[PDB]
């Protein structure tokens, strides 16, 4: 084998992704990629697997550990990481251009992630105001 080590982060899911020579093992958090019940976020991982790694996938072992509470946050944290990991293995930069087939999240992140809540006029939430009928 060999070790190439990359990170992705989307939405405070942090992906610790190792790509090693293999035989087509997909492990995410210890577990199969074929356990995943939500349809939507599964399909998310599936984009680099026929748009960055047509034949590479069967041939290589990708293990990730994806540490967030999201599931489109984990799905897209993991996607960055796998996406980048596949393109390095083949040594092509012609798969860097298969991240231009959709809105960037396979190599570029967001400078803004949250706003802390404000006390407002006394009501929850960061931006908000209460109804106004004081009479």
């Amino acid at each position: 084998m060999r070790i190439i080590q990359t990170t992705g982060k989307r939405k405070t899911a942090i992906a610790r992704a190792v790509i090693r020579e293999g035989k087509g093992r997909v492990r995410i958090n210890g577990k199969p990629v074929e356990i995943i019940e939500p349809e939507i976020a599964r399909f998310t991982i599936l984009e680099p697997l026929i748009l960055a790694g047509e034949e590479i996938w069967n041939s290589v072992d990708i293990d990730v550990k994806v540490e967030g509470g999201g599931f489109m946050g984990q799905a897209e944290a993991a996607r960055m990481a796998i996406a980048r990991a596949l393109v390095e293995w083949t040594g092509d930069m012609s798969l860097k251009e298969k991240f231009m087939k959709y809105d960037r999240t396979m190599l570029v992140g967001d400078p803004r992630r949250t706003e802390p809540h404000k006390p407002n006029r006394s009501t929850k939430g960061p931006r908000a105001k209460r109804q106004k009928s004081y009479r």
Partner: protein
């Protein structure tokens, strides 16, 4: 349960868009919404991904995400938990874009089985028709008030089409024993033929008709 999940995973890989449909079969022949209907997707056209770049970055959003958003809209302040529950997914989707995604997918299976065409071929044809093509804006310069003929933006046509179509579908579904999947599918069929039976064509006419009267 598990074998079905494996297969539901297989079909998009092989390659298929969304589930088992092809984006390939269309009949977009309208030059207006030619550059605002997006045919790049080959796996998913709702991820999360997004635009806030520019105003026509908004009409470059892949058609089905915009559709998901329009389907999602109504649902007030409630409380979704295991319980015994209710009611919650409203009657028009209290929950996430995640839940919204499922209906559109189901609706796509019912409508393909019926029409014997892809739901893309039906929906795309339906948006070209369902969209009104004239509006009046109140434009005064100098004091004198004219209510002259004004042309809709291409982006404004796409939004209005999507909005009418969802909105109307829901309207009979409410307090009723339909599957929504059916309701949605049936609204898309009549909107596409240009029948005044759909709520979509009603509004398409009424907006242009009022514009013709002011004009």
């Amino acid at each position: 349960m598990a074998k079905p999940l494996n297969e539901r995973f297989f079909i998009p890989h092989e390659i298929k868009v969304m589930g088992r449909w092809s984006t390939e079969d269309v009949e977009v022949r309208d030059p207006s919404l030619k550059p605002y209907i997006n045919l790049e997707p080959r796996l998913l056209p709702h991820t999360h991904g997004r635009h806030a770049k520019k105003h026509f970055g908004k009409a470059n959003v892949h058609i089905v995400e915009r559709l998901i958003n329009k389907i999602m809209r109504s649902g007030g302040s409630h409380y979704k938990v295991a319980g015994h529950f209710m009611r919650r997914e409203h009657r028009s989707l209290n929950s996430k874009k995640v839940k919204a995604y499922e209906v559109v997918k189901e609706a796509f299976k019912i409508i393909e089985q019926r029409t014997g065409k892809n739901p893309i071929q039906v929906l795309v044809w339906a948006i070209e028709n369902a969209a009104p093509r004239e509006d009046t804006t109140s434009v005064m310069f100098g004091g004198i008030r004219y209510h002259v003929a004004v042309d809709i933006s291409p982006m404004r046509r796409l939004d209005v089409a999507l909005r009418n179509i969802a909105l109307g579908a829901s309207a009979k579904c409410y307090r009723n024993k339909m599957s929504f999947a059916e309701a949605l599918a049936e609204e898309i069929i009549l909107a596409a033929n240009k029948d005044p039976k759909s709520y979509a064509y009603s509004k398409k006419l009424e907006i242009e008709r009022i514009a013709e009267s002011s004009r």
